[PDB]
Amino acid sequence: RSKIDAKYKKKIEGMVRRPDISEIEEATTPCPFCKFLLPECELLCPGCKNSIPYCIATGRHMLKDDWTVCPHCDFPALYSELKIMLNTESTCPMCSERLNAAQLKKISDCTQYLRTEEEL
């Protein structure tokens, strides 16, 4: 409380003196390890206790039906989302190499990135 900027302190105090519980529910989507539904930005699955791979473009948990990888670094992204952010900036968010939206490929088999790592 003592370290907060005085610009925001009165607003932060005001939000605690008058709680507003209204909040847009995060959509729940299937864990790629066990199909347990959890919020798009929740990455430790409570259904299987695995840390899920994350989209390098948006940080949501990866989905088996929208998978791609950066060609320079092999890290996973949501194909729709990485294509969208490459219209905003000319570089990978992960490796900082230059990219073009035409270099992206959608992946039909992500299972090599999803084997529970005790098997490796």
Swiss-Prot record:
Organs and tissues of expression: Some isoforms are tissue-specific. Highly expressed in the prostate. Lower expression in the cerebellum, pituitary gland, fetal lung, and pancreas. In normal prostate, expressed in both basal and luminal epithelial cells. No expression detected in fibromuscular stromal cells, endothelial cells, or infiltrating lymphocytes. Uniformed expression in prostate adenocarcinoma cells.
Effect of K49E: In SPGF72; uncertain significance; the mutant is absent from sperm neck and flagellum
Induction info: By androgenic hormones. Expression increased 3-fold in an androgen-stimulated androgen-sensitive prostate adenocarcinoma cell line compared with androgen-deprived cells.
Subcellular localization, as worded in the UniProt entry: Cell projection, Cilium; Cytoplasm, Cytoskeleton, Cilium basal body; Cell projection, Cilium, Photoreceptor outer segment; Cell projection, Cilium, Flagellum
Top-level taxon in the UniProt lineage: Eukaryota
Its biological purpose: As component of the IFT complex A (IFT-A), a complex required for retrograde ciliary transport and entry into cilia of G protein-coupled receptors (GPCRs), it is involved in cilia function and/or assembly. Essential for functional IFT-A assembly and ciliary entry of GPCRs. Associates with the BBSome complex to mediate ciliary transport.
Disease: Cranioectodermal dysplasia 4: A disorder primarily characterized by craniofacial, skeletal and ectodermal abnormalities. Clinical features include craniosynostosis, narrow rib cage, short limbs, brachydactyly, hypoplastic and widely spaced teeth, sparse hair, skin laxity and abnormal nails. Nephronophthisis leading to progressive renal failure, hepatic fibrosis, heart defects, and retinitis pigmentosa have also been described. Short-rib thoracic dysplasia 5 with or without polydactyly: A form of short-rib thoracic dysplasia, a group of autosomal recessive ciliopathies that are characterized by a constricted thoracic cage, short ribs, shortened tubular bones, and a 'trident' appearance of the acetabular roof. Polydactyly is variably present. Non-skeletal involvement can include cleft lip/palate as well as anomalies of major organs such as the brain, eye, heart, kidneys, liver, pancreas, intestines, and genitalia.
Subunit structure: Component of the IFT complex A (IFT-A) complex. IFT-A complex is divided into a core subcomplex composed of IFT122:IFT140:WDR19 which is associated with TULP3 and a peripheral subcomplex composed of IFT43:WDR35:TTC21B. Interacts (via C-terminal region) with IFT122 (via C-terminal region). Interacts with BBS1. Interacts with TTC25.
Name of the molecule in the record: WD repeat-containing protein 19
Species of provenance: Homo sapiens
Gene from which the chain derives: WDR19
